[PDB]
């Protein structure tokens, strides 16, 4: 795609989110950069409204799959870069097993040379002292497979996957994800064969930062297609 050529180097990223979870309103701003050549993301997020009212890990998937590394032989399956620069809408329902749900709608597109992810998040049905509103999730992150399929009538894609959040008692909080993405612009986009993105993420803190924040280092590779 022409879109692909926009990602051969390091690209600066901005993330802006506004959220309302059970009437707790909040905002997050993030900055960093992506290097799709290496499937690599580096960002720092800051809650600008005070304390974040949900655990940071629960927002990772919401906070730019155009930075995944597509092997050369899988170039024809990279919807995400093909929609650039005009971008794509990304919508999800995230269902926290035996707790509430997030519904997210985001638009991912270039503003100048910067790749931007603008998100609105709404959370309902949460338990006041469940794992989310009760802040019972560990500050860490597991490795997943994101299963993608074409969604031809939308000129886009779907994804379906299961995120695992470790709980501080040693258990696990499942977050089922269902995702749909729709291109914004009028150039041709790539409608892929079924495949998956293999993810890994490391969460950390900046020792000099006293605002509520998250540092994220993430690597993602497309897989599941041999030729």
Author numbering: 2 to 64, 68 to 231
Text from the published report:
The S65T substitution changes the conformation of Glu222 by relocating the hydroxyl group of the 65th residue. The donors and acceptors in the hydrogen bonds among Glu222, Ser205, a water and the chromophore switch with each other from those in the A form of wild-type GFP. Consequently, the chromophore becomes anionic, while Glu222 becomes neutral. The Cζ–Oη bond in the A form is 1.365 (10) Å, which is 0.05 Å longer compared with those in the B form: 1.314 (7) Å (S65T) or 1.315 (8) Å (E222Q). On the other hand, the structures of the B form (S65T and E222Q) differed from almost all of them. The difference in the orientation of Wat3 leads to a knock-on effect on the hydrogen-bonding network between Oη of the chromophore and Oγ of Ser205. On the other hand, the hydrogen-bonding patterns around Ser/Thr65 and Glu/Gln222 are significantly different [Figs. 5(c), 5(d) and 5(e)], while both S65T and E222Q are in the B form. The hydroxyl H atom of Thr65 in S65T is hydrogen-bonded to N2 of the imidazolinone ring of the chromophore, while the corresponding H atom of Ser65 in E222Q is hydrogen-bonded to Gln222. Although both the S65T and E222Q variants have spectroscopic features of the chromophore in the B form, the hydrogen bonds between Thr203 and the chromophore appear to differ.
Green fluorescent protein (GFP), which was discovered in the jellyfish Aequorea victoria, is a light-emitting protein consisting of 238 amino acids. GFP absorbs UV–blue light and emits green light. The structure consists of an 11-stranded β-barrel plugged by a chromophore [Fig. 1(a)]. The chromophore is 4-(p-hydroxybenzylidene)imidazolin-5-one, which is formed from three intrinsic residues (Ser65, Tyr66 and Gly67) in the polypeptide chain by a post-translational cyclization, dehydration and oxidation.
